[PDB]
Every structure is written in C-alpha cells, then in structure tokens.
C-alpha cells in the first residue's frame, strides 16, 4: 500500500525541489525567458515542476504495468540476474521517486552540450545530497538503508557513464526522464519509435502501449500540448540514437552492411550531409520498413494530437490558461491533477471495453483466508487485462476474460448492506474484505436507509475490479484486503 | 474584587439519576455495559510488554524497520521511567536493554539521535512522535504480529476504536504530555493518515481518548451565585409612558423607543407559548450581571432593566400600528387581552445584530472580541447559553458530534445556516436575550436540557455489533461516557459557542461580498474574517486555561491551517460557487482543500443559491452529508482539545509536584535517583513553551541537589543546564527591553 | 508605569495555573509555590509578612488584582545587579567570552529576538563591562 499521490515525504521532496531549484529561475542565458501564462509567471516552462511530477508518475506507471505484465505471465527483461522491473519493492520505488525529484534540479538552461550536460547533472547530484543530508533523520533509517545507498542514487542521478540499462533504479529514472520529452520533439514518429523500442525490451508491447497512452492522458491533465501521431508523414526520419538520418542506397534500400553469420544488416547511420539519388528516408518510409514494423504496433495508426473535442483555438486557450501556470507553481495542485488523471486512466479502459445516489459505496464482509487468496488470484487475473490501449485495440480478450470468469459476481441478484464511510465498515464489523464500489454515473439504486445506503445491482449492470488493495490488519489480527469495483452498464 | 463564583472539582461520577443504561428494541431490553478505559489500556500495555519479550526471545529482531525498533525502545524507556514499582521498572528496562544493544550496533546514527532524545526529556517517546511517525502504530503492530493469544472483546473494542495511532496506549502522563507537545512549534503533527484510499482523520479521536481518561468534573456554585441566591418578586414601581411618537421599529417581538439621552428603551412583550417566568428570569439575570460587571470584567454594554409588568393588549396593539411589519409582530405576541412586558434600556447598537452588513471590519473585530470574551467569562461563572442561535439529538446541532454519539464521524450539515444566525443573540455591542440561560450544573446533572438534547450520550450507546451474544449485553467504550458526560457536554458547549461565532462571521461575509466586485477586496474581507475566527478561538483558550493569547493562537495555527479555512469559508459561504459547472468546481475544490480529499456530493445546485433542500436558502453541506468546512471542524477540535489537554496536563503536573514535595520534605525517604527521576518527570510534564513551570522545576532541582549533595547529576545536567541558560536569557531580555 | 506586559501575561498564566479550583483566587497554601515559580523565593517569614498584610477582604485568599499589586511591590527589591551578574556568569570564561554566542542564544531560547536587535545589542557593548553599560 503505497503510491506517489499520497506520500507526505516524496510530496515534501518535490516541494523542496520546487522551493530551491524547480521554482527558481534559469540562470544560463540559453532560452531563459520565463513564460507568462495568464497573470502568472513560469520560470522552467520546459523542465519545471510539471516535468518532475510527470517523471515520477511515469516511474510509478512503468513499474505498475511491469508487475501487471508479470501477472499476465509474459517475459520481461533481466538486470544481469533473474529479476525484472516488476520486482521493484514499494520502498525502492519511494527511493527512486525521491531521487527523480532533483534529476533536473541542476538545469541552468535547456542547452545540451555534453560537458554542460555533465555539469548540470553534477549540480543536480550535489543538490540531492544536500537535501538528503538536511532531512537525514527521516530518510536514511527508513526510506534508505545507509549513506552508501544515498551515494548510489546520487551516482545514478549524476550518471557519469551512460549505462541506463544496468539496474531498475537506472531504467525507471532514465526512461522516465526520456519518454517525457515527446511533447516537444517535433518529428513525433521517430522519437516515439525509439522510446517504444527502448522500453518494450524491459516490459512488453501491451504494457508499453498502456504507458504511452496514460502518458498522453497525463499531458492532457497537466495542460501540455500533445503531439500527433502521423504514421504516413513525409518528413525525413532521423534516428534518435545520437542525431543522424538514414540515406537510401539509391534503389530501394538504405546503406546496408553485412555481419558475420548474417547476409544483411540493418540501416547504417550517417550524419546529415550531401545527397545524390542518395535521398534520405521519410518518416512514412521508416515506419513501414518490414524489419521494424513487425515489432512496433503503431505502424499504420494515427492519433488525434489533441483533445478529441474542443477545437484548436479553444485548445490553445486552454494551454495558455492560468491552470498551466498553477501546475507549475503548486506541488499539491499538480499532484492532484495527476492523481485524478491516473484514476480516470485506470477506470476508463473498462468503459472502453464495454459500450455504454452517491459514488463510493463500501460494503464489508468477513471471508476465510483461503477464499480471499483464491479470490484475489481471480481478481488480479481480471485486472491484468485492462491495459489502456493506444494503438492495438484488445477489447475482445479482456471482454471475454470478464464475461467467462464471473466469479466476482457474487454480490448481485440480492440486496445489500452498504454504506459510504470507510470507518463505518472499520468501526462495526471491521471486516477483513471490503468491497468499495466506484460508480459515478447512475447504475446503482443507492437508496438511503434512514447515514448509510442499500444498493441493488440489476442484471445488466456488472462489477469489474479496479485495484486490489491490502490495508493493514483487522481488530482480530488478520489482513484486510480492501478491493475496489467499478459499475459497468453491460448489455452483454 | 475579580473572581468567579463557581469552582471546579472532582467527583465520584456523574451517573446519578440518569436514564437506566438499557436500550429498548421491539420488546427486548438490552443492557448497556461500559468497557472501562484505564483498565483495558493497561491490559494492552501489559500485552505489549509480553509481546516485546516474545520478540526479543524470538530473535526476529532483524525483521523490523529501524525506526520502528527505535520507537519500541524509546517507548519502553519512557514507560519504565513512568512506572514507580522497582520490579516493573526493572522488568521494563531489562526488556529495553537488548533493543538498545541492537540500535547502538546496527544503526549508529539512529542511536545517536535516540540518546539525544533520552538526555533531553524523561519521556523521549513524546519528542520522537511529534511527526508523522505517530500515525505508525508500532504498539498494535507488534501486538498483532507476536502476541498470538486472541484478545478479549474489551481489548478488541479498544483496539478497533483506537487503531489510528500508538499514542493511544500511553499512560495518562505520557499521553497528556504528548498531546500538549503535538501543538508545539517544532511539531509537524497532523492527525491525518492519508493513505491511497482513506485519508483517515482522527482529530476527534485524540479528544475522545483524552476525555475517556479524565476524572469526572463537577462545578460547585457559590451560595450567593445567581442560581443559588434567591430574590423576591419584581415590583411594577415604574410605568413607561409608552408613546407612538417615539417608536423606531419592531425587532422581532420587541418594540423600540427613542430617548432624548440617545439611549434606546425596548419593550419585549410576552412571546406566545411561555409564561411570565421567562421575563422575570431575564430581568433578574440582567440585573445580576449589571450588578457584577466589575467582578466578572464583562465587556458587553449590558441592558439596564427598568421593570417587568403587564399592560393591556389594546395599548400594545394601538401603539404598534405605525410600523412596517405590524402583522408579523401581531402574530408573535400571545393571545390575551393582557400581556407581560419586560422593559429594558440598551444602547442603539444593542439591536443591530453582530452580522449586520453595515459595520466596517474593525468594528466587527471589536464586537466579536467583546462577545467571545463575554460568552466565555460567563461560562467560567457557570452560566451557559444553549440558544444563542436556533441551529435546528432531538433537532439540536451538536458541534462535537463525534464525541457525543456512537459511530458518527464528521460534523453535520448546517441546514439553512444563514437563516439560523439571522436573529442570533449576539449583538454589535455585546450579548442579548440573557433570559434563556442555564446554570452550568445542568450539564453535570440529568436536567431536562441534558435529558432532552443529549439522550444518546446519557443512555449509553447501542449498535448491533456492540451486542455480546454470550453475555447478552452491549459492551461499549461509549457507555463509559455515562460517568463522564459532563466533560463532553462542557466541550460541546464551547464548540457550539465558537461554531455560532463562525456562522455569524460567515453570514457577515456573505452579506458584504455581494456588494463588492474586485475579487482581491472580497478575499481581503474573507481573510480578515478567518483571522477574527482564529483570534476568537485563541481568546476562548486564553480565558478558559490562562494560556496567553499569542501562544494559544500559535498552538492553533500549528493545528488548523488558516489558509485552507480562508478558502473554505470564502468558497462554501457565498452563492458564487453555484455559477461554476462541474469541472470548474472540481478545480476550485482542488485549490481550497489543497492536500486532502475534496467535498464530494451528488445533489443538484440551484443557481444563485448553491446547495439547498428547499431551493431558496443555502446549506453548509449537501443533504445527508457532512459539513464541507473541514478546517472549521479542525479548529473547533483543536480548541477544545487544547483546553481539556491543558487542564489534564496541569492535573498531572500537580499530581507529580505532590510526589516531588513528599520527597524533599523526607516523607518518602528513598535514594537520590528516585528524587532525580521525580524531578525529571516534573520537568517533562510542563506546558510547551511555558517557561515559569520549567523555572519552578529548576528551583526544585536545585533544592534536590542541596538535599542530596553526593548524588551524581550526570544524566540530569543537560536539560537543566538548558533550562538555566533559558532562564538567564529570559532575565537578560527583561532587563534589555526594560529600557 | 505598571510593568512590562509580557510579565503580566506570565503572571496571569502562573496564577491561573496554581488555582487548583479555577475560581480566580489563590490560597496562601501555594502562594509560595507561585512566587518561587516567578523568580521570587522568600522564606516563610518574609512571605508571612504578606500573609499577614495581603488580604484586604480577609477571606484568606488573594484575587488576581491583589496578586499583581503584590508582584509590583515585590519587584522593586530583587531586581538588581545580582540577577544580571548571575545571568552573565552562567554560560562559560573570563568575563569576556563572545558576542556571537549571545546573538545565537537570543534567537532560540526564551522569547526570541530579531537579528537587528542582537546587532544593536552587540554595537551597544566583555560581559561585566557590557552589563554595566545599561
Ligand atoms: Ca481558589
Ligand atoms: Mg440530515
């Protein structure tokens, strides 16, 4: 039981990062203009507080679908020993998130000279160490283990080398800071290709797709311009590895070399230079390459590049609105926005799969331990198919899983003894199995009794799990798995 | 000259001539048995000690978080130093030794801080828990993990109600010290354990666990108090030549009249439904208060009565014709050809209610200061007012609903909140309508007031889970409040006073910000109102406990955040929030609440009004939901917990000073270390940032050194050296600011 | 003045503390205790002078205005160079230690003062020498 949005320490970590570095102006004289949104001023429009918070949320999301995929039973990457990102302990995630707050705390300006890059990261590491040593009592005993681990995370932040693919604490920081820079990179398909390939190697296609879609939702909730996906764009593709392009070999293929034990090798990198008929590769040309379009599912797909709704003029009104500068100058507000975005991205795939009175309805009951284990198994097996799809729509699989495995439908076709207060379930039966019910749109006959309510679920309204949670132990000394369901107007 | 005719004292119990603790359900008489607090807590502490022993002998010590082991060891040291038996203290320290070894071995920095705590105070666990480790219940976690023998129903209920923190199993001196220090400046304590789905507030559980510890108060009124001294009937030795040429208006049921001396003569007719007794009690109470203005140091310009007699209904009806709302007043008076009139003389401002929108903010601050000062002075005297504003458990609104009910968790919707304080008994010049007062004893006895309004508290609490199927009774920690209900209703009265202050200020703000357009000016008005409310809570604390006003205000602002109270009062008390649609409302709630879950409702807003049930008056909270003002409720609980915790801490401080003085006079001839431990405890049980208590303890430490010369002072040189340095600094600033 | 207001607040706090019955009047049974708690520790005879001549009413109890009058009367004897010297010689180590230490303690112990106040005090001044320059 731990997340970014309710921490009071990672929250204070980001608060310190905003109070000392993220909220302080750029001083490098390279794109140092503080933007003016409404009446409010933002210093680090590109790499400010919103950037840090999106990075932390990406860390949580990447690890979350990592364990999600592990529950699905597919194959993840390896960190030089049998383990994967899914094996990240929650306190290790807390350590990573406290590290990520200062990962950009040393950017004097956007300039990306390699020497200047190293200097910025050295300053970031020094600031991180100065912060931890300032709140040392509350972080080294519990959050971290010893000063050596704080030094290890300082090493990862400063990153003198470039071996991001070494430890989970390396990936969930470098990938998180890298995939955030999709909102600004102008040729979209190239960068998204590079990040998708670089992160799928760790987790898998479906989970990476989910991460990128929820990233789009994060962008929307933080008033950041969302890049459109043009699978047939005629712009010349550039490889994000370094900065180069792909010149064609004048007939139908680029410069192709040959290794030992192989007839052909992939595309050869050259610097942007003189052509001639030695043209470059267009983005559309790059995407439909049979060697790369068999692993990148977005080949041939397109995205809105904006809110599916309000027009470009209104969208531009929204981007420059006050809330853009509010997310940049309030840790609490931006964390709240991200949390609601995460909840919506967690419950909206369910509505996506199935075409379509208070909201929260806790309903506690006492169950045997073996039954709770056998029920959490078959509820996580239903949560672990609701990946928020972005390119490949996998609705039939999750719909069939929900329909056929109707073992968590043992709450309908009968009355109920529900309420809408957590304590009122803790304070009366103190049950070991709570059934929280999320239903924002009708679908429940939440009639009052009198306080508390009493619900009745029709046949054409199903309940689908959302996030199985373990909340401490009961009065009599056993674990209290507080589930969470969502109500689906399912005509099927 | 200045002193209060009522005095506080202890009693065996309030459980005299209450409703029998039996609940009637469809022909079943269920007896309601209390679960004793101070015994279940002690049994839990004993189980904790046994489980610590089982931990140490289990060698699983390496499988606990280092901060959790630090908490265990610190609590063991503090509990040992709270005990008096040699056997028990030696057992506790022999339990704490292996944990000390483990800390000094594995985690040298944690131990470096722990020894700093141990040499700084005698109960270290209260300085180690002025932060968000208090939400970590190490006690209960250990009891659940290692004590495998199941808890009885009493311990189960105690754990279930008090699972929030681990400061709920402390003995009375340690817990009271911790509660008083949690308000200290260097404390980051916030009674909110926000986990990923709950946001458990337990600011009321602290107060409940404090009250369940106190010993039942009773207030003894002097013989010549107003409710004990009795005076004869009131003679009609003065008849007012009542003349329609000088009427100004009709305030409810009161005719106003001018005076060539700029004063105002009011005539209150007998309101329909009540007898002449009410008018004479009002007359006598007003005369008594005006007689003891110097003694009480009461600030209100009080209405000097002139007489109370009867006049023919024809004369009243004939003089009232030249008015505006004649018909309403005609319907308010009683149906009788002769009616009872009470005549008093009051300044003109005595009738403009406190929340009248035609007074500048400075005058509002002055009048609110006067009214709060006077309410709480007259509460010290023993005169409570239960009908300041008709905020209509039997219909009355309980400001502290969590303490006064079984399974009530948040405050209640103040239905028609702006209607409630429309005719409030608080006026721009002071207090008014003193007639329906009620001697304080009516909370500490089973009066008709207490029987009518708080029947649930006195009858004990029932809920189907409280029923023990074997014994056939309802065993509840709530039923124990039968013995203690006087303290609960006392605190509820204070919270009601401050809630009415808040609603009056909020009505003022709502009425003034309609006629103002520049949003900075509106938010300046609301910020001044939030300041006035916090200052009124500080004044309540200063009057009730003697804590200086500035220090009380600081101890509040540590607990109830002033800016969120600003934003919630400015937001939910004006119709302006009804214009916004759903999403804009969502984003504005994100700003007002700012770190804690938003107020969620499903009812539909009526435009230009907001939340409502009739559709034309504004509620403070959706139907059948809690009040949306959190920081007001946090302020009320902070105020009442400060008052009661200071009283209980001072009780403990004197209970320990007696033990110290029985040593320095040889009445208990023991070793030197016993006396030094006594003085160390006597130091730790002083109010936060209260210097003179520490100075007194320092004097006693010097005397103990003088009596026991050859004793080692190595373990007590640090804190008392700091106290000596602070005292020297104090006198230095005194001399420096003297010039 | 009468006296410094911050002493009035401390007096009111101590008086309302040692009033075990919360009535606004203290019995001489612990008037000594409150007096020693206010930097005034007199022998039973010295205070017995006031137990004789304190209570104008004669009920055997002291109301708060009488308590303030008592403190105003008794604050004109002890307040002298003795207490100032004791305060000076309680830190460390030859009559002139430092001014940085004094500036440090003036900001965190007791009712804290401002950096500007500490600077003014330092420019005003050698503990013995500086103490006698006011
Ligand atoms: Ca007394
Ligand atoms: Mg209701």
Residue numbers in the entry:
A (entry chain A): 231 to 506, 510 to 589, 760 to 853, 861 to 902
B (entry chain C): 100 to 491, 502 to 848
C (entry chain B): 3 to 94, 97 to 129, 138 to 146
Please quote the authors directly.
We added l-glutamate to the prepared SidJ/CaM-SdeA pre-glutamylation complex right before applying the sample to the EM grid and analyzing it by single-particle cryo-EM. Interestingly, after 3D classification of the particles, we observed two well-resolved particle classes, Class I (15% of total particles) contained both SidJ/CaM and SdeA well resolved and Class II (17% of total particles) represented only SidJ/CaM with discernible density while SdeA was found to be disordered, presumably dissociated from SidJ but still tethered to it due to GraFix. We pursued the processing of Class I particles to obtain a 3.7 Å reconstruction of SidJ/CaM-SdeA in a post-catalytic (PC) state. Overall, the PC state structure of SidJ/CaM-SdeA superposes well with the pre-glutamylation state structure with an r.m.s.d of 0.71 Å over 1351 C-α atoms with noticeable differences only in the migrated pocket region of SidJ and the mART domain of SdeA. Interestingly, post-glutamylation, the SidJ loop (residues 492–501) making up the migrated pocket becomes disordered in the structure, while the canonical pocket architecture remains intact. This observation argues against the role of migrated pocket as an allosteric center that stabilizes the canonical pocket by binding to AMP. Consistent with the idea that AMP releases upon SdeA glutamylation, the electron density corresponding to AMP in SidJ’s migrated pocket is missing in the post-catalytic state structure of SidJ/CaM-SdeA. There is, however, no electron density in the post-catalytic SidJ/CaM-SdeA structure for the added l-glutamate near SdeA E860, likely because of the flexible nature of the modification. In the post-catalytic structure of SidJ/CaM-SdeA complex where one cycle of glutamylation occurred, SidJ exists in an apoenzyme form, with no nucleotide bound in either canonical or migrated pockets. We have also determined the post-catalytic state structure of SidJ/CaM and SdeA, in which we captured apo-SidJ bound to glutamylated SdeA, likely poised for the next adenylylation and glutamyl chain extension reactions.
SidE family of effectors (SdeA, SdeB, SdeC and SidE) employ phosphoribosyl ubiquitination to target multiple host Rab GTPases and innate immune factors. Upon activation by host Calmodulin (CaM), SidJ executes an ATP-dependent glutamylation to modify the catalytic residue Glu860 in the mono-ADP-ribosyl transferase (mART) domain of SdeA. SidJ is a unique glutamylase that adopts a kinase-like fold but contains two nucleotide-binding pockets. Our structures reveal that both phosphodiesterase (PDE) and mART domains of SdeA make extensive contacts with SidJ.
